[PDB]
Structure 1
Amino acid sequence: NAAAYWDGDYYVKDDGSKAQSEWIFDNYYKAWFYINSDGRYSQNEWHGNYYLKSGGYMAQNEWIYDSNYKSWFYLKSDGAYAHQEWQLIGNKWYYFKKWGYMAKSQWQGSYFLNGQGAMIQNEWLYDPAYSAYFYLKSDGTYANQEWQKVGGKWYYFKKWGYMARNEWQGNYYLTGSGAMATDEVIMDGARYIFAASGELKEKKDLNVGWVHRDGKRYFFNNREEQVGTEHAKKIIDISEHNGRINDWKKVIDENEVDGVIVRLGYSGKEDKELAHNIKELNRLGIPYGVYLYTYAENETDAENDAKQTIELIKKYNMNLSYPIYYDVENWEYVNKSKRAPSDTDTWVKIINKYMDTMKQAGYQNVYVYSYRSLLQTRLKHPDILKHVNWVAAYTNALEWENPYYSGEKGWQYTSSEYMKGIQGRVDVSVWY
């Protein structure tokens, strides 16, 4: 007489009565609908373990995004949401937490789910929480207590998946990058010779670095050769990243430090320890210079860097025995929105601007600091290189010449020295 039909939002059942608070299957649509207590079909909402989409159709074998929970959900073959379980969907593995929330950007035991919720396979993962590298294998599990060949190089993963670095594993040494050593490594006052396949061949004891010879002191690089003379100076650079230094006199005497380069901060921001560092060095009469890490992008930025530098110098009553350093590197913001110009000409302009501003303000003991590879590429210009007298190269020898600068200079040869009176690694240079 009038059965099994939709009357707007209402549904008339097999008999001839209105549906109410019940599931009905429509044969035309081949779909389930849940009819609410109001008599109307539910839509854009959950009912128990099931989701009713726009138009009322129960979701089955499909993803649903719920704006209320800001979460993806997956609805199984019977409509029930996936929860506390793994599902293979479109040839990828997904994990669903309690209440059906898709896991994303997190671990689930030995597996890691990316931002789209997919289990990672054959990929590197840095995890800040564990502050280390992991490698998720073909099966999705993190590599552990085993070797892995990745991108043509060999890596060792320890218990809990940690990538070994700067450490031994049997006859093999994992370098700073984590990759197996295949040639030579100088460390612990020794030279180590590895076969091309990685196993240690030979160990030779060396006496290198700062060596004390009968009342005198010299610096020897890793190729057992002298840098500078007996008057070579040990210069550290310090920043908030070294934490707070409570006993500066201890630091200076016990490590035989001749001077310090102190971080001012970076473009627009003052180093947290600058005030304390300047105060202490001033009071103790330790020779120091300073450096600003630049995030410049143009001449406006370069002028702002100099202005900031000048303000800080007068503010803290800085007494500068060593230069003011423009720390020039391949910078990038943490959110990666901006990164340094690549072209030589833009940096000629930036560096020239900074120098010119400093000069007109009365500061002429101003120089550029950078690392070797950059001075060889995007910085290789007579107008820049004329300002360079402090070069980083964490190598066995500097092996870099600068025709455009003559006189006293520094080589930052390490970022991993330990020193009495300081916690953690310290940057150290030889001045010569």
Structure 2
Amino acid sequence: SDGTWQGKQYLKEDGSQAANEWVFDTHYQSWFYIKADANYAENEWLKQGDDYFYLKSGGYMAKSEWVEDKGAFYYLDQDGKMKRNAWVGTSYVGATGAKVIEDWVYDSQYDAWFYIKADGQHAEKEWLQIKGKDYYFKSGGYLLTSQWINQAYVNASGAKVQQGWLFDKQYQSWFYIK
């Protein structure tokens, strides 16, 4: 390529000054975003339609990588686009792209609730107390709802029931929980 960096500015193959545009510099094999002031975007987000991109230090577009911003982790896909509402390995990124921690996740593809502990790992084959109530997560992390777990009963919200009547449809009989 005959494209060249002159400080933070990029001259294109034809010698024109890049500005307000993406450039792909084969010398780095990297995308870069050149701002309206003809300087490359660096250590910043770029919104383009619905999509977010992150320009790292030196202006390289982030891609297939995790970035930390204001104490939150964001994943950029192969094309540089910030992932939203998805599992990225064992992590879940929410609506804003931020890795979910200490919170519920409803995933329509498993039709199941999950809980990501503060430590960033999904609850799995275990009891947790979440906001003062008890919830049991199966293998794979799926919240158990409306069933007996040992001597305990978890209701439709997944919360262990403390006391009261339950009509069990499995046994077609009334139980009193104390």
> How does the TM-score come out when normalised to structure 2?
0.77
- For residue 135 of structure 2, what is the aligned residue in structure 1? 134
Equivalent-residue separation in structure 2 for 1:54 and 1:173 (angstroms): 62
Equivalent-residue separation in structure 2 for 1:143 and 1:93 (angstroms): 20
- For residue 156 of structure 1, what is the aligned residue in structure 2? 153
Equivalent-residue separation in structure 2 for 1:126 and 1:9 (angstroms): 52
Deviations along 1:87-114, one digit per CA (max 9) or x if unpaired, are 232xx140312x3233221112322122
Give the share of equivalent positions with the same residue, in percent. Answer: 33
- For residue 110 of structure 2, what is the aligned residue in structure 1? none
2:105 is aligned with 1:102? no
Deviations along 1:348-404, one digit per CA (max 9) or x if unpaired, are xxxxxxxxxxxxxxxxxxxxxxxxxxxxxxxxxxxxxxxxxxxxxxxxxxxxxxxxx
Deviation at 1:140, TM superposition (A): 2.0
Amino acid at match of 1:135: Y
- Helix, strand or coil at the partner of 1:139: helix
**1:234-253 residue pairs with structure 2 within 5 A?**
none
- Is contact 2:145–2:157 with CA below 8 Å preserved after alignment? yes
- Is contact 2:74–2:93 with CA below 8 Å preserved after alignment? no
Equivalent-residue separation in structure 2 for 1:88 and 1:72 (angstroms): 11
- For residue 72 of structure 2, what is the aligned residue in structure 1? 71
- Is contact 1:11–1:18 with CA below 8 Å preserved after alignment? yes
Deviation at 1:173, TM superposition (A): 7.9
Deviation at 1:39, TM superposition (A): 1.3
Deviation at 1:16, TM superposition (A): 1.3
Amino acid at match of 1:59: A
> How does the TM-score come out when normalised to structure 1?
0.34
Deviation at 1:174, TM superposition (A): 6.5
Amino acid at match of 2:149: Q
Deviation at 1:120, TM superposition (A): 2.3
**1:219-234 residue pairs with structure 2 within 5 A?**
none
- For residue 40 of structure 2, what is the aligned residue in structure 1? 41
- Is contact 2:127–2:136 with CA below 8 Å preserved after alignment? yes
- Is contact 1:121–1:137 with CA below 8 Å preserved after alignment? yes
Would you tell me which structure has more helix in proportion to its own residues? Answer: 1
Amino acid at match of 2:129: Y
- Is contact 1:66–1:73 with CA below 8 Å preserved after alignment? yes
* C-alpha distance 45-134 of structure 1, shift in aligned 2 (>3 A): same
**1:263-342 residue pairs with structure 2 within 5 A?**
none
2:122 is aligned with 1:125? no
Deviations along 1:36-72, one digit per CA (max 9) or x if unpaired, are 11211111001111000111111111111112xx422
- Helix, strand or coil at the partner of 1:100: coil
Amino acid at match of 2:29: K
Equivalent-residue separation in structure 2 for 1:52 and 1:126 (angstroms): 40
Deviations along 1:317-367, one digit per CA (max 9) or x if unpaired, are xxxxxxxxxxxxxxxxxxxxxxxxxxxxxxxxxxxxxxxxxxxxxxxxxxx
- Is contact 2:115–2:141 with CA below 8 Å preserved after alignment? yes
Equivalent-residue separation in structure 2 for 1:118 and 1:14 (angstroms): 48
- Is contact 1:95–1:117 with CA below 8 Å preserved after alignment? no
Equivalent-residue separation in structure 2 for 1:57 and 1:122 (angstroms): 41
Equivalent-residue separation in structure 2 for 1:96 and 1:147 (angstroms): 31
Larger Rg: 1
Equivalent-residue separation in structure 2 for 1:24 and 1:40 (angstroms): 12
- For residue 15 of structure 2, what is the aligned residue in structure 1? 16
Would you tell me which structure has more strand in proportion to its own residues? Answer: 2
- For residue 30 of structure 1, what is the aligned residue in structure 2? 29
Equivalent-residue separation in structure 1 for 2:149 and 2:26 (angstroms): 55
- Is contact 2:20–2:34 with CA below 8 Å preserved after alignment? yes
Gap regions ≥5 residues in structure 2: 107-112
Higher relative contact order (CA 8 A, sep 6+): 2
- Is contact 1:94–1:118 with CA below 8 Å preserved after alignment? no
* C-alpha distance 32-138 of structure 1, shift in aligned 2 (>3 A): same
- CA RMSD for the aligned pairs? 2.6
- Helix, strand or coil at the partner of 2:18: coil
Amino acid at match of 2:55: L
